[PDB]
Design an enzyme around this catalytic site. Structure first.
Site, PDB file in Angstrom:
ATOM      1  N   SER A   1      10.593 -15.749 -28.125  1.00  0.00           N
ATOM      2  CA  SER A   1       9.761 -16.943 -28.308  1.00  0.00           C
ATOM      3  C   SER A   1       8.520 -16.623 -29.171  1.00  0.00           C
ATOM      4  CB  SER A   1       9.331 -17.502 -26.903  1.00  0.00           C
ATOM      5  OG  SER A   1       8.419 -16.599 -26.192  1.00  0.00           O
ATOM      6  N   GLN A   2       8.090 -15.376 -29.170  1.00  0.00           N
ATOM      7  CA  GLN A   2       6.962 -14.997 -30.030  1.00  0.00           C
ATOM      8  C   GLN A   2       7.260 -15.168 -31.509  1.00  0.00           C
ATOM      9  OE1 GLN A   2       8.759 -12.730 -28.460  1.00  0.00           O
ATOM     10  NE2 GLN A   2       9.047 -10.999 -29.888  1.00  0.00           N
TER      11      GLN A   2
ATOM     12  N   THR B   1      18.755 -14.696 -21.114  1.00  0.00           N
ATOM     13  CA  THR B   1      18.967 -15.400 -19.890  1.00  0.00           C
ATOM     14  C   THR B   1      17.693 -15.346 -18.991  1.00  0.00           C
ATOM     15  OG1 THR B   1      20.753 -15.777 -18.325  1.00  0.00           O
ATOM     16  CG2 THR B   1      19.909 -13.478 -18.528  1.00  0.00           C
TER      17      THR B   1
ATOM     18  N   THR C   1       8.294 -18.337 -22.781  1.00  0.00           N
ATOM     19  CA  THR C   1       7.072 -18.984 -22.373  1.00  0.00           C
ATOM     20  C   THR C   1       5.962 -18.936 -23.451  1.00  0.00           C
ATOM     21  OG1 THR C   1       6.241 -17.035 -21.220  1.00  0.00           O
ATOM     22  CG2 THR C   1       7.558 -18.561 -19.893  1.00  0.00           C
TER      23      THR C   1
END
Lengths: 312, 312, 312, 312
Positions: free
Chosen positions: D44-45, D13, D75
């Protein structure tokens, strides 16, 4: 032993007055013993000479009672007050300015973390002797070069010519720079006995510019006029003629630029020697005002005012 | 068949007057049939309404005699003229402005390659219907957003809010954007029968700002006043009061910002509805002047001027 | 009298043999007595450890024969060579690097004025003790922070984290900064007896990243691996597994970022203490390699490597 | 009535389970009827081809059940996932990606207001037909140009070549741009029947670059290799030799740049026609991989790959 940090407020609260702050940002208690005073209560857009004089005297007077100062200030004119303090403060303990681009009641309000980071900055030994600092968006910026680059962005504060001094990550600062121009206790400027400052205004240059703003200032007996010139501090013809005249009759005239970065350089576009004008260097119009005001408390000679613009 | 390109000069030569250019930059002959006229001969800092009116009429009148126009213009006020032309030109053939940050006699003079690239731009079919363009440092910039960001840098021209339209590499342009706001032949503004424009000045806001510049303009019967506000177009108290009064008596007042990027947004910091003020959006003060001047040739109603500021 | 400046070339000419630079830019005569030498002749894309060792030895040896050095160098790898010399040169006289974004025969070639400004910088007494400098586009940049930001722009070279040291206008430099990290004579690195450097390679991270590049380096016996991570030095899982294992069995592993500005910070995303990794701080991948090569000549211990990354 | 917006989550979240987002940010209720679904849960990595294929299929399938999508995403790799979807999604309803630079529990967490602004964007009729969008820090950015510029800054996400599409102030978007390259329903790429994508890897160039990473990819049978070149896509000699040979024996090779802005341009530094290489233009290495993977589903011919790089 935590350092003792004083918070001077000039307006509203930036974390959602002034001794609510440790309740608003509890994490402050882990880094410092914080005391707050409300010095004035004014919107930043109505900032004035008398608030400047008050702030510089309070800091100079309380220097020995505290380990560092954080000043809460609205963002509109932060860059002007920071430079004024950078020239007139004689305490070499950390003086840190902070504000917020989003109201404290907004979602994702920036003020709480900004405030935290400013206290961190004022509490760090390494921050001393760097002059007056602005701490916004995890960055430590010097009071001379810092300006606001965007109307609404939380990242708006940047040192647009020479860059930031340090960046803050998890409570630690990586300092890799310090300003070379003289500041704080190395300046001759002393405001302890002054109750007012010389009168300096600003006029804007643009195509077909009216000379009436400049005339109005001259007729009112202003001590100094700063020109927000076009390009490398050039002037619209009619404004030029009005200011050349005013310089011969003894008004101090500083050529700056409406262009947001870069120096207004001496004798490049305009023969400054001949008209008795001063070139602002990297000082934008509103900063050039601050320095001209102070310069005028020592001297009215253009060539000496130029030397001051080259050293501070 | 090479396109026919007309070069309109407004001042000095930027590649080291006006039919020497094919001798100065021989490589032009490979891309276009170039003809030059000297329209006026004025330094860019003395740019005025009457040069604007002359340029827009020449372009509108010669539109059918040529395939595209390059205008040579000094850099100080390029951004103002470009936006004026962007609103008043009714030719949808390429109109390209170009200048030089270094004199033509300097080492590494930028004007020759700038000129070459501007002709390339005006000769490319893809450049039509994009409005008036500025071509500086290998970049194609729209006339609305382009401004000068640095006093001396050759790279100074940038579109600081929305970015460039294209980049030029070895004579080819990679266009990936076009401006959304209405320009050129989609505007209602027509200057063909005008010999002068409404009077609009600019006043700067800063700490302890004098209201005398604004008063001087009001007393002179100016049609419009643009405020270079602090932050999101805020005003120093005394300037605010002078302008609020002037708005009720019928002066058009536009809030812009001295901050170099970002919008001055409507009813955020100031109740525009209540005082009859207009918010400039992304238009910096000198651009907001251009649009207010044109708006005032159609209407004096603030709410209609606001709509114009939202569409062009 | 004028200072004596030596120009060391590594490639082709950036204005107009290296002994004819005074004929290409005759204005060099008014500011210094210039001597040129061709040290090597290669394209900057092919820059290698053997050129670096040659350059640094040559400067260290000839330090007393000259008042300052200017090195002409291709733009592709300038930033790597400049940081190597910044750490290995034991001469505190000015060492200035310079190149050209446009070929010397092109219109508006940037090299001549860049060369001129480089010599001005190397001749200025104020330029001494600032580390190795890069002068490009009227700007003096420190060798640690300087990088190339744009593939083609003449203004590409910026110090993206901390800013420039000074600006050059009309042959005068306004220095307002100096780097704080240790450089030149204050470093422990000495290459005078080295004939080769430790083998350090770089791997890139991205979505679905292969571990094969990293394995290939480990199987070849590389001394060190620099990871160009995602975000704040983070690693794709396969790459992370390979590097964890490498670090446990003797390979030095530094986490940098592919992201072009900001620090890869210590124990934030990844537990560096656990895996024995080192965080690069503000050094980008290619510059982190340079420091890692040199650190490996003194130590193979991660904690000590980390401290070197925190001081140089 | 209000639009129906679906929020697809890929990770944890960014404000405050995905079905409780309306409790974390109750202001979401005034602008839309929100439904959330967790599509996957990874960092996200670790983003990978299988997540991308899942996301795009899911959006394509549910396009008619909803007025717009918001995807919450880490991000580190946002910029890769956004360009993949920009090329593979056949829904012309708003698809908006959003994340947070600060953890949701931190002071001045950015996620809540970013989420809010993402929903505002997905609900605005004007947002349709612009391709896949990233909304961060009050700014709407196209998925092709958007990249992360700073390791930690909340303002990191910028469209560095061509600029943002619009800005959000008080729930209203001022759109002044739209991307010109083809996206979404206008592309030929269709992943609905694909279960895997061609293998494309990235190699970095730097001084003394090893060819081992490139060899490792070629020996493993990779379909494509992206070179993160120096300057304008240039290659270290060993890397160049390996890639030349690979390209002659069937590997697709794209030259991009490690330099963070500007185009890697066609036949400038390197003779692409001779070696069979493809120039990336403004796509950075990680984005060039995305387009190269997709191009390889349609063709293995370099000239046709080049044209795809010139249209998408």
């Amino acid at each position: 032993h935590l350092p003792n940090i004083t918070i001077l407020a000039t307006g509203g609260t930036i974390a959602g007055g002034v001794e609510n702050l440790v309740n608003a940002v509890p994490q402050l208690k882990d880094i410092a013993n914080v005391k707050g005073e409300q010095v004035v209560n004014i919107g930043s857009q109505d900032m004035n000479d008398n608030v400047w004089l008050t702030l510089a005297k309070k800091i100079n007077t309380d220097c020995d009672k505290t380990d560092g100062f954080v000043i809460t200030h609205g963002t509109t004119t932060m860059e002007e007050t920071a430079y004024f303090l950078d020239l007139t403060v004689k305490c070499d303990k950390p003086v840190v300015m902070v504000g917020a681009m989003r109201p404290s009641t907004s979602m994702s309000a920036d003020g709480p973390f900004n405030l935290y980071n400013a206290v961190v900055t004022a509490a760090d030994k390494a921050s001393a002797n760097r002059g007056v600092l602005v701490v916004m968006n995890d960055t430590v910026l010097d009071g001379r070069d810092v300006t606001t680059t965007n109307t609404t962005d939380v990242a708006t504060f940047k040192s647009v010519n020479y860059g930031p001094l340090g960046y803050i990550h998890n409570g630690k600062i990586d300092y890799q720079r310090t300003p070379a121009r003289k500041h704080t206790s190395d300046t001759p400027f002393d405001v302890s006995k002054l109750n007012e400052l010389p009168k300096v205004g600003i006029v804007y240059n643009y195509a077909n510019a009216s000379d009436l703003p400049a005339k109005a200032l001259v007729d009112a007996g202003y001590d100094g006029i700063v020109s927000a010139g076009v390009g490398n501090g050039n002037l619209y013809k009619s404004v030029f003629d009005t200011l050349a005249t005013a310089a011969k009759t003894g008004t101090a005239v500083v050529r700056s630029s409406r262009v947001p970065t870069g120096a207004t350089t001496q004798d490049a576009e305009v023969d400054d020697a001949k008209y008795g004008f001063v070139a602002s260097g990297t000082l934008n119009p509103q900063k050039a005002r601050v320095l001209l005001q102070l310069a005028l408390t020592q001297t009215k000679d253009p060539q000496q005012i130029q030397q001051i613009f080259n050293q501070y």
